[PDB]
Amino acid sequence: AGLDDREQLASVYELRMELEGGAAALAARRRNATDLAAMAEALAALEANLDHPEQGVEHDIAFHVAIAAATHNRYYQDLLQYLNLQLRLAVSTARTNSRRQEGLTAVVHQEHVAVYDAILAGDPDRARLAATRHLQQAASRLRLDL
Amino acid sequence: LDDREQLASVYELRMELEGGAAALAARRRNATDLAAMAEALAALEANLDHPEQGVEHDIAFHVAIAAATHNRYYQDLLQYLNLQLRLAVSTARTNSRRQEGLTAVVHQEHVAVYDAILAGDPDRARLAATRHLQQAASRLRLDL
Ligand SMILES: O=C(O)CC[C@H](O)C(=O)O
Ligand SMILES: O=C(O)CC[C@H](O)C(=O)O
Ligand SMILES: [Cl-]
Ligand SMILES: [Cl-]
Ligand SMILES: [Zn+2]
Ligand SMILES: [Zn+2]
């Protein structure tokens, strides 16, 4: 049936909330200094992209992919790769929408930072919470009604 | 034997994928989903006597829960990981036949997931599904 429709979009964030919540938990328990570099590298790129958010798309996906790689679980990275088009459709639709309200992108940036600090700090439940919050808020900014 | 580390990563991933699916199914299941899960449980109940195709009926049970999410990406990922599922399930079920009343204990773990989903209790569903994988990982002496 093809996969750009809004039911699709709600399904993507629905799946992300589980998959990326779990991945953040494992990452907080298993991340090495290389993983943290990969996450901070993506954040720094996003910080420079706050003014113009269509280049932010790849850096946004890249931040979440690094979180998946920080699980040290071979299967998690593959699932995110297998879903890369769905990730893009969700991340792209959202970053367009949030450039509409002033400063909203700076606010979304801190949703990412919150996931990074929790994973740095070693706290799995804090990491899972922050990751499910970036997504819940992203879906709610899009009125998806999960 | 030397594949403990890879079975643990499968069970690790299943725990997040299937916990989330079971909670989703508890919210969205319909009467067709219930029948599909219940028929699978009945097939697994019969396989206590004859072990043939028990792996397929176990997997068909977890696949049915994924269908009951009514989110197409849960089914795709489980189909995508079918080979990993088969290797874990078949490893676990042969190991479980080795101890006398073990496979009946496992059958109750499956039932408990269906019961939570039938009740429409997503937190209960999520815990039932992950307890099943945890205990299955314990039975295999893996260390998440
Ligand atoms: O919601 C936004 O403004 C950006 C999208 C978010 O970063 C995501 O990963 O889906
Ligand atoms: O642990 C067992 O004996 C059964 C394994 C379980 O059904 C599974 O889904 O992996
Ligand atoms: Cl950002
Ligand atoms: Cl069973
Ligand atoms: Zn994001
Ligand atoms: Zn099972």
| Header resolution in angstroms | 2.4
* Strand spans (E) along B47-114: none
CB B96 within 8 A of CB B12: no
Query: Angle A80-A81-A83 (CA atoms, 0-180°, nearest 5)?
Result: 65
CA distance B126 to B28: 14
3-state secondary structure of A57: helix
Establish whether A109 is an annotated binding residue.
Answer: no
Structure tokens at B21: 């699916």
Domain architecture of chain B: domains with CATH: 4-49+69-139 (1.20.120.530)
Structure tokens at A146: 């999960």
CA distance A139 to A75: 26
Identify which of A4, A97, A8, A7 has the alpha carbon closest to the alpha carbon of residue A53.
A97
Structure tokens at A34: 């290389």
Structure tokens at B137: 């990982």
- Give the best residue of B69, B73, B85 to mutate against chain A (max A CB count within 10 A): B73
Report CA-CA distances (Å) from A68 to A34, A39, A98, B66: 13, 10, 24, 22
3-state secondary structure of A103: coil
Q: Give the up-direction half-sphere exposure of residue B3: CA atoms within 13 A in the CB hemisphere.
A: 8
The dihedral built from the CA positions of residue A44, A47, A48 and A54, taken in this order, carries a sign that is positive
Contact residues of ligand 2, CB 6 A cut-off: B 58, 62, 88-89, 92-93, 96, 106, 136, 139
CA distance A31 to A76: 14
Q: Give the containing element (helix H, strand E) for B86.
A: helix B82-97
Structure tokens at B135: 């205990």
Establish whether A64 is an annotated binding residue.
Answer: yes
CB A49 within 8 A of CB A56: yes
Chain B hits for A125, CB-CB cut-off 8 Å, are none
CB A107 within 8 A of CB A91: no
Technique used to solve these coordinates = X-ray
Structure tokens at B66: 């994924």
B35 phi, psi to nearest 5 deg: -60, -45
Torsion angle, alpha carbons of A36, A39, A45, A51, to 10: -130
Structure tokens at A130: 């922050």
CA distance B50 to A19: 36
Taking CA–CA distances from B74, the nearest residue in chain A reads A15
- If you measure from the C-alpha of residue A112 to the centroid of ligand 5, how many angstroms do you get, rounded to a whole number? 6
- If you measure from the C-alpha of residue B96 to the centroid of ligand 4, how many angstroms do you get, rounded to a whole number? 10
Sequence-distant (≥ 6) Cβ neighbours of residue A57 within 8 angstroms: A88, A91, A92, A95
